[PDB]
Design a protein around this nucleic acid. Structure first.
Lengths: 81, 129, 87, 25, 216, 206, 96, 121, 97
RNA sequence: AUUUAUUGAAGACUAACUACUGCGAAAGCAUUUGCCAAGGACGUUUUCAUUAAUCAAGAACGAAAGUUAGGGGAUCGAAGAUGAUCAGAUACCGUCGUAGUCUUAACCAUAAACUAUGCCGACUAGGGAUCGGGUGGUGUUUUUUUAAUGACCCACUCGGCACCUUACGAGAAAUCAAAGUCUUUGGGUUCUGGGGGGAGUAUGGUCGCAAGGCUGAAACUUAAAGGAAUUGACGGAAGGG
RNA sequence: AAAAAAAAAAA
């Protein structure tokens, strides 16, 4: 473009871009707090778990892994933290 | 691999000014680079520049005018004495009047006329005009 | 430049492409010189009241002439939100 | 001529010289 | 009678345009050796070498001659012209013409201590045409033009008094050598320096000024 | 700056969005164009007609900055633009060129179509890319009507429009001629709607 | 990196590479192998005394037709057979 | 062959473009006005020119011809050009716009009617 | 010198292609350089198809077809009046007619 | 006999799908199914913490042909035998056909082994498509109208095989997004070359069962060899007349 | 899609 601001660009482009090629590399992941039906025992969880997470009170299931974002069980109420 | 961050920086700068751009993004922002650009800016070749403190190594952004034809580097950082300065300049500069050679001395980084004024010598890094 | 005692030398101090502060050669036959007319108190054009903009063959070849001109105009005030320093 | 054939010829010659020098030694 | 067909030639014949300085300042396209001879009458021509060429056909070898010519006033102006033609006189003629049309300025300077009346160039400048690369370094006074005969004639006609040359390539192709020197002394004014960092107000075009006494 | 009478009026907007000039190219794009606005589904991209209007007024300012209108040129090899440029030539000096360009019309001074303009205008640069080549050879600026995909190299002022649209082309030409007359003082009232017709500026197939 | 090293401590590499490419030259190879002292019938000298053995009507290479009136000599310090040219019109009659 | 040269074609072209309200589709009378109106050094060439002009006027009597232009033709051209409607279809027949376009109008802050239609993929 | 950035063929990133045989001269050649065409043809001809359908029970049957993929090599192709030769620029052109 | 039909045995090959597609360090790799162990890319608000880049010497793998010993030995087929052709034809074409082709256990260690472009890294113009992964979208479809998936569409992104256009740049040019950022000559690094021939020859070494490889000159001789392109001429090269 | 070899050198 031959002229532009490389210090105050748009969050549009900066969320479009990779997580490293921005002005400052930062993660695109997030955490959740999840409730399963029955025992509340609310559980903190990562988005990209790599694991099969379960509740401490009951071994029911919370989420399952993937190569990307995890796949939460069908009946589970999640809140982005 | 990546060894002369300074060289990569100056290469990016030369490519930008060749394209006629007026801004450029630099990586990874070390001290010698800061001082090198301080000198260039003081003599009026570029304009302003910002350090960005990512907590890793630092980035730099540089606002450029068109007063720059070639900012360069000398790998290896050669050892240089007080007449070697003159013959170096005669080799790598366009004329006797303008253009500056840069060299780290024990008394900090500076250009060759300043090092003449101080009567001190050391390790040539690069040059600019 | 000039000699020991003023007395300018260096005939043909040349022009400079504005978007780059870059010298325009004598034979940059793709360079151009634009003259934008002013307007005053009616909208009508004034003759001989130009805002000038010179440009070089490199820029015009890379096609960035349009955007450089847009930003120059918006800086000189004869344009508006068209350009954005933030892409 | 062709390098393939010059090379083949030369190899046969080397072989022959090898064996006659074997006669001598 | 000249009788131009050009805004530029019309303005010149009328006397509004009076300097190739204005011309080069505006980077104007020039199409009339009449214009150039009106502006810089004090120039000399010089034929450098004449090599013939040949084309092969059914019948014999159609030969025509290639002339290369320098023109200059030795206060900072030169031009270079090459032409192929079936006859030597017309070759030299059109070479003179094309040189006059290719005329360009020179940015002379000082090796140091800008005493007066520049002797040499300002900067180190190179030029390339095919294999050849000519380099031109500024020299002190009395050093003289250190170069081959052809480049020496070229720089004399440019008005340079002293210069050092460090060259490379098949320099025996005078075409490429002279074109390289041409390009280098063009890069002189193509080069930027602190004494030209100063910003200027972009003067206006003589065409826009004298547009009334222009074409019609 | 401007007196603000030169802002886009909703009537001109009605005409523009009737011609659907804002309906530019498809997901095709040239990165020399941030003029887009909220790209539509169906793989279609929409234009800032405000920026279109501003650039149009700018081109008008330049054309009025010319002393001699004949030194401005109209190029339309495109059938959809020949009539438009001819009416431009009628209502201005505006030496037009329809049909073929005849290369060597800016150079080769001997030629009968030899012109020496201080400015040129283009209906579509991809189709008119010869005359801009000669302009680059001979130190001349450029005015062009681009979509979001046109070859913006060797191109000074460029106006985003739907050059695929007959009515879009003729409308833009109408607007430009109108603004030039307004700035020259022929047309007196900026609020005057200028009875003349884009239908006159348009093309007809029979 | 243009191939060659550039480190500030690589002069050894550079010297030895120079030595080998110098061997790739001609004159260095010659001077250091002593071809002249060991061949080239002279002792690497310029001139040499000799004794005529006989005379010759050596024919010319092409494109040309000539007989070049040379002689055969037995150089002394080596005892070596050589041919040598007698340049002028009729000197072969003076050098019987 | 019976093919004709650029001399003939150019001559007939000029004669037609500036003597249209004149010579008709008869070779004999065209020939007579030809050797009345222009100088030609041969009867044969005259005849060829007259015949080609006749063929051209046949084309004209049925349809215009590329490369040619006489006063009546250019007059009809500029007239059919200057034709315009008295309705200006640009003028409203009821207007439609996309949702993106309504958003554009809003961002511009302007007063306009809209008949928004939904464009689906 | 180099006449073709593809050099003859369609190999960029393999090394080896396990060739096939040109049918007209039984000649080995890789599958990426081979000329491949395909000949799909009605079995009989548009001339005698009428005689067939006239002397045929099972009316409107199908007129089935024969399909065969043909690998020719360069020499046999140019002899059989195929890809014959092109100038430089249209040698760069890659699409069919 | 050929040919047709029904069967069985043998051994190789893995069609069509099969492409400016994939993997692997290269050579190279294609039926299915399973076992073994490995690998890249992607994701990661996981860990270590500069361990890294290229590298002599020294090591592993290394098409085909070839060699040794066993098995197998269907095709095709160096040699060889034969029928033609031709002035001749132990050459082209045809028919047979040992070795070999295949495999196990060992050797050989080369190749137009080619992208004729050493590796690592950075930056520099546009455009779209594709493979793997990932993200977002009330998007479309499939199920149980519905869900979740899966497959397709749109946008984005990382990493790949590549590709189209221009040349700002480069180059002797052909051409090149690297063959650019190099007379304004320096990011790091290994290897190689110094007119052509003789000569990758001789000798001496060393490796190998051998064939041969790797290393590797001299004498002597020569003024031109050669590269890229131009215009012609020519063609048992094509197209048109 | 039988056959069809050779032409001293010099300029």
């Amino acid at each position: 473009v031959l002229v532009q601001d490389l210090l105050h660009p748009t969050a549009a482009s900066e969320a479009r871009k990779h997580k490293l090629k921005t002005l400052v590399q930062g993660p695109r992941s997030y955490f959740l707090d999840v409730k399963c039906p029955g025992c509340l025992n609310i559980t903190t969880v990562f988005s990209h778990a790599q694991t099969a997470v379960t509740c401490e009170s009951c071994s029911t299931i919370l989420c399952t892994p993937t190569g990307g974002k995890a796949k939460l069980s069908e009946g589970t109420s999640f809140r982005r933290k | 691999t990546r060894s002369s961050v300074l060289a990569d920086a100056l290469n990016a700068i030369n490519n930008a000014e060749k394209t006629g751009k007026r801004q450029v993004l630099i990586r990874p922002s070390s001290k010698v680079i800061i001082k090198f650009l301080q000198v260039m800016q003081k003599h009026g070749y570029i304009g302003e520049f910002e350090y960005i403190d990512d907590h890793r190594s630092g980035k730099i952004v540089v606002q450029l005018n068109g007063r720059l034809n070639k900012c360069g580097v000398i790998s290896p950082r050669f050892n240089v004495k007080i007449g070697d300065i003159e013959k170096w300049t005669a080799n790598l500069l366009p004329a006797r009047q303008f253009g500056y050679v840069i060299l780290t001395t024990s008394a900090g980084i500076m250009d060759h006329e300043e090092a003449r004024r101080k009567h001190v010598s050391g390790k040539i890094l690069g040059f600019v005009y | 430049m000039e000699n020991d005692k003023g007395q300018l030398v260096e005939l043909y101090v040349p022009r400079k492409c504005s978007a780059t502060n870059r010298i325009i050669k004598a034979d940059d036959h793709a360079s151009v010189q634009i003259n934008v007319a002013k307007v005053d108190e009616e909208g009508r054009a004034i003759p001989g009241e130009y805002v000038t903009y010179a440009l070089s063959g490199y820029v015009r070849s890379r096609g960035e002439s349009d955007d450089s001109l847009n930003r120059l105009a918006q800086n000189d005030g004869l344009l508006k939100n068209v350009w954005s320093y933030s892409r | 001529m062709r390098a393939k054939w010059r090379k083949k010829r030369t190899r046969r010659l080397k072989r022959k010289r090898r064996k006659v020098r074997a006669r001598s030694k | 009678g000249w009788v131009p067909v050009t805004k530029l030639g019309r303005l010149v014949k009328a006397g509004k345009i009076t300097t190739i300085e204005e011309i080069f300042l505006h980077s104007l396209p020039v199409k009339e050796f009449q214009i150039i001879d009106t502006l810089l009458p004090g120039l000399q021509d010089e034929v450098m070498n004449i090599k013939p060429v040949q084309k092969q056909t059914r019948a014999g070898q159609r030969t025509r001659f290639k002339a290369v010519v320098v023109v200059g006033d030795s206060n900072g102006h030169v031009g270079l012209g090459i032409k192929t033609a079936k006859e030597v006189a017309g070759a030299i003629r059109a070479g003179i013409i094309i040189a006059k049309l290719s005329v360009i300025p020179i940015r002379r300077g000082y090796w140091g201590t800008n005493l007066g009346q520049p002797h040499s160039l300002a900067t180190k400048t190179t030029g390339k045409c095919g294999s050849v690369t000519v380099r031109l370094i500024p020299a002190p006074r009395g050093s003289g033009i250190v170069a081959s005969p052809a480049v020496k004639k070229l720089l004399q006609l440019a008005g340079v008094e002293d210069v050092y040359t460090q060259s490379n390539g098949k320099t025996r192709t005078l075409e490429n050598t002279l074109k390289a020197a041409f390009v280098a002394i063009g890069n002189t004014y193509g080069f930027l320096t602190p004494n030209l960092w100063a910003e200027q107000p972009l003067p206006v075009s003589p065409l826009d000024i004298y547009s009334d006494e222009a074409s019609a | 700056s401007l007196p603000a009478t030169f802002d886009l009026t909703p009537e001109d907007a009605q005409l523009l969005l009737a011609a659907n000039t804002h309906l530019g190219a498809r997901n095709v794009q040239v990165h020399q164009e941030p003029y887009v606005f909220n790209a539509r589904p169906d793989g279609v991209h929409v234009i800032n007609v405000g920026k279109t209007w501003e650039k149009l007024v700018l081109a008008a300012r330049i054309i009025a900055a010319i002393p001699n209108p004949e030194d401005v040129v109209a190029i339309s090899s495109r059938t959809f633009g020949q009539r438009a440029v001819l009416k431009f030539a009628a209502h201005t000096g505006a030496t037009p060129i329809a049909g073929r360009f005849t290369p060597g019309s800016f150079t080769n001074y001997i030629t009968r179509s030899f012109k020496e303009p201080r400015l040129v205008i283009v209906t579509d640069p991809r189709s008119d890319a010869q005359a801009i080549k000669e302009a680059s050879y001979v130190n001349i600026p450029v005015i062009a009507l681009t979509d979001l995909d046109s070859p913006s190299e060797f191109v000074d002022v460029a106006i985003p429009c739907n050059n695929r649209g007959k009515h879009s082309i003729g409308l833009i030409w109408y607007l430009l001629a109108r603004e030039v007359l307004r700035l020259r003082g022929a047309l007196v009232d900026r609020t005057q709607p200028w009875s003349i017709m884009p239908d006159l500026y348009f093309y007809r197939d029979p | 990196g243009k191939g060659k090293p550039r480190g500030l401590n690589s002069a050894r590499k550079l010297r030895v590479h120079r030595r080998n490419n110098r061997w790739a030259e001609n004159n260095y190879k010659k001077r250091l192998l002593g071809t002249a002292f060991k061949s080239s019938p002279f002792g690497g000298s310029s001139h040499a005394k000799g004794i005529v053995l006989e005379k010759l009507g050596i024919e010319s290479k092409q494109p040309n037709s000539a007989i070049r009136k040379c002689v055969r000599v037995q150089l002394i310090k080596n005892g070596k057979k050589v041919t040598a040219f007698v340049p002028n019109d009729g000197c072969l009659n003076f050098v019987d | 062959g019976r093919v004709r040269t650029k001399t003939v074609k150019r001559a007939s072209k000029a004669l037609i473009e500036r003597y249209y309200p004149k010579l008709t589709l008869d070779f004999q009378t065209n020939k007579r006005l030809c050797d009345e109106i222009a100088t030609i050094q041969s009867k044969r060439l005259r005849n060829k020119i007259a015949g080609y002009t006749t063929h051209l006027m046949k084309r004209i009597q049925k349809g215009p011809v590329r490369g040619i232009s006489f006063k009546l033709q250019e007059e009809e051209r500029e007239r059919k050009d200057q034709y315009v409607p008295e309705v200006s279809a640009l003028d409203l027949s009821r207007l439609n716009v996309d949702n993106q376009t309504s958003d554009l109008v809003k961002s511009l802050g302007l007063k306009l009617p809209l008949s928004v239609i939904n464009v689906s993929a | 010198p180099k006449k073709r950035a593809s050099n003859g063929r369609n190999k960029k990133g393999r090394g080896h292609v396990k060739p096939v045989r040109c049918v007209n001269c039984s000649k080995s050649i890789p599958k990426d350089k081979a000329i491949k065409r395909m000949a799909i043809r009605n079995i009989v001809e548009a001339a005698a198809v009428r005689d067939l359908s006239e002397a045929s029970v099972y009316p409107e049957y199908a007129l089935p077809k024969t399909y065969n993929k043909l690998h020719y090599c360069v020499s046999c192709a140019i002899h059989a009046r195929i890809v014959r030769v092109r100038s430089r620029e249209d040698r760069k052109n890659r699409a069919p007619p």
